[model samples]
Target: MIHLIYSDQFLDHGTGRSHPESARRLTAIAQALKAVSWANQIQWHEPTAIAFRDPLPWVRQLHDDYYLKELQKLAESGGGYWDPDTPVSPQSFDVALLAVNACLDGVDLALQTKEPVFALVRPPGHHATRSTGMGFCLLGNVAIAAHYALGLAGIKKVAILDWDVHHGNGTEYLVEENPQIIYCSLHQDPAYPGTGQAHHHGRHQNILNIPLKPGADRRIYVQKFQDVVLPYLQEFQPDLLIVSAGYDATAKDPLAGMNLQPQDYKVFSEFCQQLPCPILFALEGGYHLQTLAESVVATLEPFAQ
Candidate 1:
């Protein structure tokens, strides 16, 4: 059975009514998943409570102290905006912390069960950097999870494959200096927080940034996976694979410019399954509700077998 780490409390981290990254995103995916043919095969689990496992120690590793304090203050003071795009409700701080815990739980479940685990959480991290939270992201969920995974006994090398439409600038920045981790991203060029470039390999030559042009479709994505991403990961032989599974590239998504369909995610999931390592998936960015739900179902579809 596929383990889905989720919480209804995620909806409490509210963005406003007009915001695309609303509580409805998770609800939509939940509804869609329940309707699926293999819905009974999905086993859901709640993330570790803050009282049980304090995540700040791990969060402090990547984010600056001053920034975390400020974020906390903002949330405690009944919410405000970190930037124009990112909103913070009073419960955002707590929910974001729970989201981080969800990611860590995903790693633990994947490694223990040797199966697929999806941490279907939000405030879509990957855009938040060392000192700031932007692009509707508050904390570096996958990056923090990678660091947490490395500390585990059997996990030496961790590979992160970010398929978000926008580059995972924060994730790359957080992990690039470390030789034990490899970060690969396929993002649209000239996009928000534009940072990932083809030539900017990490310090140990561990990063692979493939910037796709506007309107890139399934054919281009498949070609890149076959030609570049697959070979790179196969050579690394990582103990764990974490997918920054953002569905913004789907044709129905409003914020991004790419032509991927929901079915394309199944192909991507199939490719990821080719690796022997257990996989952990954390939600990133996907605006269009119906397509986002469809894409996530496609992602988990392969594991149901």
Candidate 2:
């Protein structure tokens, strides 16, 4: 069975009605999954309570202490914007903490079963940097989970593959200093928060950034998976693989310019399945509600089979 780590609390983050990162995204995806033919194969698992895991210690490792304090303060004082693009609702800080906890729970479940686990928590976290929360992200969920996994027994190395339409600038910044973790991203070059250039390898040479042009499609992605992504993962041989899975690259998505369809994610998932490590997938960006839900189903279909 496929494991899904989710919480109703995630929907309480409140990104407001017209926002692309609204809580409706999760509900849409959940409804679509339940309607699928193999829905019964999905084992729904609620994230561990924050009191049980206390993700703040792991979050502290990646974000600036002062920034964390400020985020909480902003949440407590009604609500405010961390950046022009990101908002902090009254419950956002608490919900973000739970998102981080959900990611950690995904790590534990994947490690225990040596299977793929999906963390369906949100306020998509790929753009939140150490000192700033931007791009609709309040905290770096995948980055914090990578660090948390490193602390666990027998986890020596981790590999992160970010297929979001936009680069995971925050995740790259957080984990680049540590040689134990490698970050690879395939994102649109001239998109939002444009920083992932092909030449900027990390300090430890652990980063691989492939910038795809606008209107690129499955052919380009499949080629990259065969020639770049799969080879890099095979060479690194990480104990765990974390996918920053985003469906915004879909042709129907409103925010990005890529020609990929929902079915394209199945190809990506199949490539990841070839790797010899337990895999964890955390939700990122994917607008266009219906397409987003379909894309997520495409992603998990390979693993379910």
Candidate 3:
């Protein structure tokens, strides 16, 4: 069984436009989930209305302290933008905090229970980092959650697998030195935040980057993952697996260029299931609504089996 954890916070704010990373994207997902027949199969819960911290301590664990203070001051300034691609309005910080907490909630649930937990909230966190956030991300939520699980929960040997088409530079930078965390990114190398090279493995040899070419298809994707990534994962043998599950990697998304289909996501998720760690899924980049839902359902379907 799986847990589908969502927050209206996912739909509450916008990037001041209807861009691919817009709130409208998640709104479409929200509407689709409400309208779906299988809606009743998943348990839903409101995020714990945890008291917001000034420099939210959990996020602080993975982010630079100076940067966190600056972002807070920036967020309070009414219209703060980390970069042109990452806009920060007055509500942006709180929303992003909720996103962090949501990811934390998923991580907590997975660690506490054997059931799979999906934090289907966004303003996706993979692109955010310790210094600054962009590409519509405010925090490296999964990275922070992984840090929390290590520092706070005493869980060791954590693995974070990012499947977003864009490399999770933020996550890589944050966890690269933390020896207990094994970070691997399967992404498009020449894409935005553009620096996931095969040679960028961490100093402790903990980070692995598997950059797929822009037009790669599922067949090649499967072969490459099986060839390279699976071997490292098997060798590394993590205690918990945290996935930055981005559906934009699917070919159907106009914003993405890969050649993948809905059923391919089932293939992807089933591969993750092969790993020994209990998986915690945190939503990242994905734009196309129909395929997003169908692909998410397809991904979860195999997990259910």
For this target, which candidate reaches the highest lDDT against the unseen true structure?
A: 1
Model 1 is weakest, by summed lDDT over 10 consecutive residues, at 187-196
Whole-structure CA lDDT of model 2: 0.93
| Model 3: worst 10 consecutive residues (lDDT sum) | 46-55
Please report, in order, the local distance difference test score of every candidate based on alpha carbons. 0.94, 0.93, 0.79
Residue pairs of candidate 2 with colliding backbone atoms: none
- Report the C-alpha lDDT of model 3 over 1-305, residue by residue, as the tens digit: 57877877777646776667777666665566566566666677666655743327778777788887787787787765688777777677777788888877777788887677888887788878778887788889888888777754547788998888888988898889888898988887578777989998878999899888888778887987788877888798887889898888888887768878877878878888888678888888888888887777776776555
Q: Which pairs of residues collide in model 1?
A: none
lDDT of 1 at 239: 99
C-alpha TM-scores of all predictions: 0.99, 0.99, 0.93
Q: For residues 196-236, what per-residue lDDT tens digits would candidate 2 score against the true structure?
A: 99999988999999999999999999999999999998999
Clashing pairs in 3: none
Model 2 TM-score relative to the real fold: 0.99
Backbone clashes for every candidate come to: 0, 0, 0
For every candidate structure, what is the RMSD over all alpha carbons to the true structure, in angstroms? 0.7, 0.7, 2.0
